[PDB]
Amino acid sequence: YASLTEIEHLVQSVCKSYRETCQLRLEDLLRQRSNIFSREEVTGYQRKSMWEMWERCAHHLTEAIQYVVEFAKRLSGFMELCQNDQIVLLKAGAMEVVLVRMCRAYNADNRTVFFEGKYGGMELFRALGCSELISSIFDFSHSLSALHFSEDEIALYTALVLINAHRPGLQEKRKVEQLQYNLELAFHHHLSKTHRQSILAKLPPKGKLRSLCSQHVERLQIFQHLHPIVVQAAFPPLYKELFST
Amino acid sequence: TLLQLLLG
Ligand SMILES: CCS(=O)(=O)c1ccc(CC(=O)Nc2nc(-c3cccc(Cl)c3)c(C(=O)c3ccccc3Cl)s2)cc1
């Protein structure tokens, strides 16, 4: 039964955990927004082989996932969970957190995302051969940018995305429930103080993040089936573990 | 799993 003091302390603890593991500073992402891919560069990306484009993406995604794992390690209560629960939560949630975090690198004004040192539109990703998945992620990032998340709001929300007592395979289901509930109290308290509880009904529907992650895994299957050597040889081991079927 | 190793 966490007190108001303890709840306020959880708010600060979560926000600090996030701040220390946010990968790129928001200031930098914003200052880089004028740095956009030239038409020559865009053409170059579209002319890239499918294998090279997937391999690049797998690397960047793995990098982003590593910061999420670190976020989890610093998140109050997570390391107190049993090793099996930690895995279940991260295996199901890491990519979901990355997708939420990604909205920070999305510029809604010109519909671009920060990728490989510059900003680029969705036409940059043609060579992957999953235009639907790409458009879906771009749309999702657009939906989220409209909410104008603060860094603190991202911290609290992504903590909840990770700490989900409804993930299949949890041993200490009740210990995860208790952590989830306290993080919800932390989130709702933070929102009430800043008069931002309106965003709660505007957050992604209960199966949207699940859908995007399933789509990703599926498009990887289409890729991997046709290019099985490259995945074995050059893709990050962690990436295969999380996504290869 | 590699997640185990990363968690330490
Ligand atoms: C998320 C943490 S931070 O905000 O600090 C931070 C850090 C580094 C980057 C650079 C980066 O790594 N940028 C990428 N952007 C995309 C991408 C692709 C399509 C649409 C959109 Cl909106 C983004 C990538 C994929 O590899 C990718 C492939 C297929 C499906 C889903 C993704 Cl996310 S990597 C961006 C943001």
CATH number at residue A49: 1.10.565.10
Helix A173-193 × helix A151-162 angle, to 10°: 160
Closest-CA distance, A225 to chain B, in angstroms, reads 23
| Radius of gyration over every alpha carbon of chain A, rounded to an integer in angstroms | 19
Q: Does A74 touch chain B (CB under 8 A)?
A: no
Beta bridge partners, A213, equal none
| Radius of gyration over every alpha carbon of chain B, rounded to an integer in angstroms | 4
A215, A136 Cβ separation under 8 angstroms: yes
Contacts of A86 in chain B (CB under 8 A): 3, 7
Amino acid at A165: A
CA pair distance A89, A11, nearest whole angstrom? 21
Q: Does A244 touch chain B (CB under 8 A)?
A: no
**Resolution of this entry, Å:** 1.9
Q: Pairing mode, if any, of strands A112-115 and A106-107? A: antiparallel
| Nearest of A7, A140, A150, A162 to residue A72 by alpha carbon | A162
H-helix or E-strand containing B1? none
H-helix or E-strand containing B8? none
Residues flanking ligand 1, CB < 6 Å? A 22-24, 57, 60-61, 64, 98, 101-102, 104-106, 113-115, 125, 134, 137-138, 141, 216
A210 φ/ψ angles, rounded to the nearest 5 degrees? -55, -50
Question: Which residue has the CA at smallest separation from atom 34 of ligand 1?
Answer: A60
Domain count for chain A, please give it: 1
A7, A190 Cβ separation under 8 angstroms: no
Tell me if residue B2 falls in helix, strand or coil. helix
Q: Does B5 touch chain A (CB under 8 A)?
A: no
The CA A61 to ligand 1 mean position distance, Å, reads 7
Residues contacting residue A232 through CB under 8 Å, at least 6 positions apart: none
Which residues form the domain of A193?
Answer: 1-245
Q: Does B2 touch chain A (CB under 8 A)?
A: yes
Residue A111 burial (10 A CB sphere; 0-12, 13-18, 19+): middle
Distances (CA, A) of A155 to A87, A88, A89, A129, A189: 20, 20, 17, 33, 14
The answer to whether A87 contacts B6, with C-beta atoms less than 8 Å apart, is no
Q: Pairing mode, if any, of strands A118-120 and A112-115? A: antiparallel
Burial A6-35 (b: 16+ CB within 10 A, else e): ebeebbebbbebbeebbbeeeeebeebeee
Atom of ligand 1 nearest to the CA of A58: 26
A126, A47 Cβ separation under 8 angstroms: no
Strand order through the sheet with A118-120: A106-107, A112-115, A118-120
| CA atoms within a 13 Å half-sphere pointing along the CA-CB vector of A104 | 22
CA pair distance A134, A115, nearest whole angstrom? 13
